[PDB]
From Swiss-Prot:
The modification Phosphothreonine is found at T6. This is Focal adhesion kinase 1. The modification Phosphoserine is found at S2. Interacts (via first Pro-rich region) with CAS family members (via SH3 domain), including BCAR1, BCAR3, and CASS4. Interacts with NEDD9 (via SH3 domain). Interacts with GIT1. Interacts with SORBS1. Interacts with ARHGEF28. Interacts with SHB. Part of a complex composed of THSD1, PTK2/FAK1, TLN1 and VCL. Interacts with PXN and TLN1. Interacts with STAT1. Interacts with DCC. Interacts with WASL. Interacts with ARHGEF7. Interacts with GRB2 and GRB7. Component of a complex that contains at least FER, CTTN and PTK2/FAK1. Interacts with BMX. Interacts with TGFB1I1. Interacts with STEAP4. It comes from Homo sapiens. Residues 4-141 are annotated as: Interaction with ARHGEF28.
Length: 141
């Protein structure tokens, strides 16, 4: 995963976009940091991801009303998905701190990374839905 491409839309005051970039950067940050890190360090990293995720979700809540009825369904479903994904991520994080300095620690991290990476893929996916819904509204041929 890179931070997201920019397609044809102007992103200067694109909040959805800014926030998705935030949440994506935060996942990447955590990932590069994990394997060497004690719990004193990895719990806050995961806190950060949740914050960036809440920020994104409120931004989105505000944008729905401005986009066509036809599109609302998916945008909500794709929202659920990201709450779910974070659910999964916290699970694996509690398991890894439950299992520190044991042998099974590190498969517990491999499961954190797996879930963090779905979170970021699904963020990027939300972006696309939103963009497509805008393009519709702005009147794309
Ligand atoms: Cl916006
Ligand atoms: Na509409």
């Amino acid at each position: 995963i890179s931070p997201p491409p920019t397609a044809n839309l102007d992103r200067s005051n694109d909040k959805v976009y800014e926030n998705v970039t935030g949440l994506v950067k935060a996942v990447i940050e955590m990932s590069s940091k994990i394997q060497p890190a004690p719990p004193e360090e990895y719990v806050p990293m995961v806190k950060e991801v949740g914050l960036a995720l809440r920020t994104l979700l409120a931004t989105v809540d505000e944008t729905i009303p401005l986009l066509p009825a036809s599109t609302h369904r998916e945008i909500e479903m794709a929202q659920k998905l990201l709450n779910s994904d974070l659910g999964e991520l916290i699970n694996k994080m509690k398991l890894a701190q439950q299992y520190v300095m044991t042998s099974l620690q590190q498969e517990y991290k491999k499961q954190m990374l797996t879930a963090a990476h779905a979170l970021a893929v699904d963020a990027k996916n939300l972006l696309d839905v939103i963009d497509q819904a805008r393009l519709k509204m702005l009147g794309q041929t």
